């Protein structure tokens, strides 16, 4: 049953009540598991919008990085969970954290063809020039993968960056 589940599994399953009890019976709201994942990260990775909101409101650290330098943001960006991404951005989280996978939230959003995530990240100052291990930046990924709608959004932003440099 629920008692045999980690606080992380409860978050990921969207078990609001059970989670709410576990984090009040002890200070496990920011407890990292073996991979360094927090309950917030598990909720983000599984699209549990209501749980993400509850956790954030109750003091879950949105900026904590996992052992691979994963964030709740990068996990939610890779899956295109636009509402969760917005909530994390509203917390003032860093958007340019480079992880041990050679990724950033923007690179993940582009890779997943998640155009709304891409727009949000760019507005929060995500850098479209940061590259993967293989030397692909956000524009390079969009072009190669054939994500023309993402490419269009990045292009409009690049024009603005260019206008600022001139």
């Amino acid at each position: 049953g629920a008692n045999s589940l980690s606080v992380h599994q409860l978050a990921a399953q969207g078990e609001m009540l059970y989670l709410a009890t576990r984090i009040e019976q002890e200070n496990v709201i920011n407890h990292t598991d073996e991979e360094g994942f927090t309950p917030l990260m598990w909720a983000a990775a599984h699209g549990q919008i209501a749980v993400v909101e509850f956790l954030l409101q109750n003091g879950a650290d949105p900026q904590l990085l996992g052992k691979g330098r994963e964030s709740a943001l990068s996990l939610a960006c890779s899956k295109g969970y636009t509402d969760i991404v917005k909530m994390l951005l509203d917390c003032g989280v860093d958007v340019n954290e480079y992880d041990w996978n050679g990724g950033t939230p923007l690179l993940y959003a582009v890779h997943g063809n998640h155009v709304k995530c891409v727009k949000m990240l760019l507005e929060s100052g995500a850098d479209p020039t940061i590259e993967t291990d293989s030397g692909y930046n956000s524009m390079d990924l969009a072009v190669a993968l054939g994500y023309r709608s993402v490419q269009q959004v990045i292009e409009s932003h690049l024009l603005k960056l260019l206008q600022n440099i001139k």
Binding site: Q13, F37, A45, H46, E70, S74, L75, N101, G102, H111
Partner: peptide, 11 residues
């Protein structure tokens, strides 16, 4: 059918 470990995809 239980939620899988969070994992970022390869890029």
């Amino acid at each position: 059918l239980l939620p899988t470990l969070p994992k970022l995809p390869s890029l």
